[PDB]
Design a protein around this ligand. Structure first.
Ligand SMILES: *[C@@H]1O[C@H](CO)[C@@H](O[C@@H]2O[C@H](CO)[C@@H](O[C@@H]3O[C@H](CO)[C@@H](O)[C@H](O[C@H]4O[C@H](CO)[C@@H](O)[C@H](O)[C@@H]4O)[C@@H]3O)[C@H](O)[C@H]2NC(C)=O)[C@H](O)[C@H]1NC(C)=O
Ligand SMILES: *[C@@H]1O[C@H](CO)[C@@H](O[C@@H]2O[C@H](CO)[C@@H](O)[C@H](O)[C@H]2NC(C)=O)[C@H](O)[C@H]1NC(C)=O
Ligand SMILES: *[C@@H]1O[C@H](CO)[C@@H](O[C@@H]2O[C@H](CO)[C@@H](O)[C@H](O)[C@H]2NC(C)=O)[C@H](O)[C@H]1NC(C)=O
Ligand SMILES: *[C@@H]1O[C@H](CO)[C@@H](O[C@@H]2O[C@H](CO)[C@@H](O)[C@H](O)[C@H]2NC(C)=O)[C@H](O)[C@H]1NC(C)=O
Ligand SMILES: *[C@@H]1O[C@H](CO)[C@@H](O)[C@H](O)[C@H]1NC(C)=O
Ligand SMILES: *[C@@H]1O[C@H](CO)[C@@H](O)[C@H](O)[C@H]1NC(C)=O
Ligand SMILES: *[C@@H]1O[C@H](CO)[C@@H](O)[C@H](O)[C@H]1NC(C)=O
Lengths: 588, 12
């Protein structure tokens, strides 16, 4: 009765200083306090823990809760706790083990007296607020603290060296603050129990200090978005339990350490956006590897064959390097490969047949290589694929019949290869297709009528091929179509007179075909057309006067069989190059 | 509020 009375009173007093518009604390306003929402008691009915996470509470920090004599845990995570923290706010909180104030609206400085008022803390989080001034040097005085998270605030100055005394620390998160340009303090090497060090976006400069080799329990090292320099130290290779190394977007140079391949515990490695030179290490036995990212470096050599030992590898992005040679034939066969971007390298040889072996492959990006040969029929059955960019390679042969109608395929970019054949009527199946980009190839046959059913399509770019027959009347009823480029082909016939469906059409480019008849009147009514190229055709008759409604970047009706008079808007001599090569055409 | 500690999803 007594410790229930005391505690119910303390909790209700706390509640009256907060505002609760979602009515999260209705259960506080007949029943025992130990069964109220967010409230936990020990066996003698004393409140031990108060967890109000995600309760939409608004108001100052309810320091009255610290008057609860057995309170060890307080969470106000993800609320709208506002104002600043006073010294006095934690006067009575000396029993607390856990304090979580992350995701609120706190402003002002962290109190310097906090460690004196909170001597027993193990877990302190104030992540994602608007805190400012410096991290107090007095933080070195915590004798028990295991996890410190001040990530995502506006804290200034430099990371205090005194933090190195807090040798009970297993996690230190200071990422995403406004520190002055400075080095990683050497004293942080004292924190030999650290498993997580997250100093991303902390304006760090210089090398990773040598003293951090003493952090042999690191599981996660994350130093992304700094200007760190020097080698990636090879002692990361002899971390027995390392799972994640994140170094994206620094100025690291030299080579990846050669011994990397023996890091069996490693799940994720990212050293992208650096100045790394040399090769990818070989004799890789990276068994637990899920993700490797080395994009935007100056790496050279092959992708080693021993990457196929990584049977859980799902993400591989090495784009924007100087990588050479042929890729492992067995790549993907025994991996759940999901995202693969090897663009802008100097790879050669064929694309592995079983790259989508386990059916998980979504992105296959290989822009700007020298890949050769044909696309496997296995890829043509890879229904997981959403994004496919194979442009600017040495590829040839015919595309698999199933490859044009994969359900989730959004981008099919094949341009600037030697691909042959006709586009099959199985393209009807590609219900999510936005962008077809097949310029500069050697395709032939008709453009299928089935394309018109794909209501998503915004782009049909198939310039410089050998397409023939008429343009399907289907293509008019594609409300979302933006760009139609079928220039430099063998297309014959006319344009449909009815074009009101093309509300979003911006570019229409049909130059260098065998097209005929008059230019439809409704081209001038099209509300967002800026590009119109119908030159090098056999278009005859009078130029419609409705084209004067348009503001065009490009207007080219040259080298046709046109007749009559040029519309008066385009009468001036600067437009004259747009109409040359037409027998029966003059200016007034 | 805060980006997660993990890989970059920059791709072409
Ligand atoms: C990878 O490399 C670096 C990280 O080392 C990174 O460069 C940084 O990017 C930020 C923002 O992306 C840039 O900082 C800018 O600073 C100027 C003022 O000096 C302003 O234009 C911006 O600051 C304002 O930000 C708020 C608005 O968002 C405002 O409310 C506020 O009042 C500020 O005035 C802007 O943030 C700068 O170029 C660097 N900064 C540092 C510290 O390095 C680069 O962007 C990263 N690139 C990639 C691809 O990852
Ligand atoms: C922070 O709290 C808000 C409010 O409780 C959370 O928003 C809710 O999110 C869930 C989905 O997880 C939905 O069921 C609710 O409809 C959302 N409500 C509102 C008002 O947006 C939010 O998820 C929490 N954020 C975090 C990071 O935990
Ligand atoms: C906490 O900081 C953020 C970022 O400075 C503030 O949120 C918004 O910031 C952008 C500019 O980055 C403005 O366009 C918005 O209008 C800001 N919201 C406002 C002024 O309400 C946020 O205000 C800060 N919170 C507090 C309590 O100071
Ligand atoms: C209008 O289009 C025609 C082609 O239909 C352009 O003429 C070609 O110009 C290029 C210049 O690189 C030459 O290589 C070709 O030999 C030309 N072809 C013919 C048949 O003459 C013309 O220059 C375009 N004009 C404008 C103003 O866009
Ligand atoms: C806390 O939030 C409420 C409403 O969102 C506001 O009226 C009140 O004055 C805030 N307190 C501070 C110190 O900003
Ligand atoms: C804490 O570390 C600072 C600087 O790193 C040092 O000067 C001080 O003596 C240390 N204090 C204790 C109590 O360890
Ligand atoms: C990898 O090899 C080096 C010796 O060349 C060693 O220091 C390191 O401990 C090895 N790593 C593992 C995880 O065994």
């Amino acid at each position: 009765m007594g410790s229930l009375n005391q505690d119910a009173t303390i909790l209700r007093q706390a509640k009256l200083g907060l505002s609760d518009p979602a009515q999260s604390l209705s259960s506080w306003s007949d029943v025992t306090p130990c069964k109220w929402l967010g409230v936990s008691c020990d066996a003698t009915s004393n409140v031990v823990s108060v967890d109000l996470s995600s309760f939409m509470l608004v108001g100052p920090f309810p320091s009255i809760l610290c008057h609860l004599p057995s309170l060890h845990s307080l969470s106000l995570y993800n609320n709208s706790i506002n104002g600043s923290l006073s010294a006095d706010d934690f006067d009575t909180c000396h029993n607390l083990i856990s304090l979580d104030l992350s995701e609120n609206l706190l402003v002002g400085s962290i109190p310097k007296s906090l460690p004196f008022n909170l001597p027993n803390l193990k877990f302190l989080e104030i992540s994602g607020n608007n805190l400012s001034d410096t991290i107090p040097s007095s933080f070195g005085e915590f004798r028990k603290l295991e996890s410190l998270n001040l990530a995502g605030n506006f804290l200034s100055g430099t990371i205090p060296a005194s933090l190195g005394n807090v040798t009970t620390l297993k996690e230190l998160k200071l990422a995403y603050n406004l520190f002055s340009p400075s080095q990683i303090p050497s004293q942080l090497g004292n924190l030999t129990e650290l498993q997580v060090l997250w100093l991303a976006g902390c304006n760090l400069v210089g090398p990773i200090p040598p003293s951090l080799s003493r952090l042999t329990s690191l599981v996660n090292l994350d130093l992304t978005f700094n200007q760190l320099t020097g080698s990636i130290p090879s002692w990361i290779t002899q971390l027995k339990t390392v799972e994640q190394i994140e170094l994206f977007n620094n100025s690291f140079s030299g080579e990846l350490p050669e011994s990397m391949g023996n890091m069996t515990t490693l799940k994720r490695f990212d050293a992208s956006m650096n100045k790394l030179t040399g090769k990818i290490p070989d004799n890789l036995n990276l068994l637990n590897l899920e993700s490797l990212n080395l994009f935007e470096n100056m790496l050279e050599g092959p992708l080693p064959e021993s990457i196929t030992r990584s049977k859980t590898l799902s993400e591989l992005k090495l784009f924007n390097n100087r990588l050479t040679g042929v890729l492992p034939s067995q790549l993907g066969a025994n991996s759940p490969l999901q995202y693969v971007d090897l663009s802008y390298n100097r790879f050669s040889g064929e694309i592995p047949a079983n790259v989508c072996g386990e059916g998980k492959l979504e992105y296959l990006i290989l822009i700007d290589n020298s890949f050769s040969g044909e696309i496997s029929n296995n890829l043509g059955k890879c229904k997981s694929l959403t994004r496919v960019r194979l442009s600017n390679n040495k590829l040839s042969g015919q595309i698999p019949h199933g490859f044009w109608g994969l359900p989730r395929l959004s981008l099919l970019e094949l341009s600037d290869n030697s691909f042959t054949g006709s586009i099959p009527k199985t393209i009807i199946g590609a219900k999510n297709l936005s962008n077809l980009r097949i310029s500069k190839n050697r395709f032939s046959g008709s453009i299928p009528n089935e394309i018109g059913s794909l209501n998503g399509i915004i782009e049909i770019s198939g310039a410089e091929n050998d397409f023939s027959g008429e343009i399907p009347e289907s293509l008019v009823k594609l409300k979302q179509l933006s760009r139609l480029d079928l220039s430099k082909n063998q297309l014959s016939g006319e344009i449909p007179r009815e074009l009101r469906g093309w509300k979003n059409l911006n570019e229409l480019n049909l130059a260098n075909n065998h097209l005929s008849g008059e230019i439809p009147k409704e081209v001038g009514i099209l509300p967002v057309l800026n590009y119109l190229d119908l030159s090098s055709n056999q278009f005859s008759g009078e130029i419609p006067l409705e084209l004067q409604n348009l503001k065009l970047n490009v207007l080219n009706l040259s080298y046709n069989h046109l007749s009559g008079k040029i519309p008066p808007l385009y009468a001036n001599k600067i437009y004259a190059h747009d109409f040359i090569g037409n027998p029966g055409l003059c200016v007034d | 509020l805060v980006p997660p500690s993990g890989p970059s999803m920059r791709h072409n």
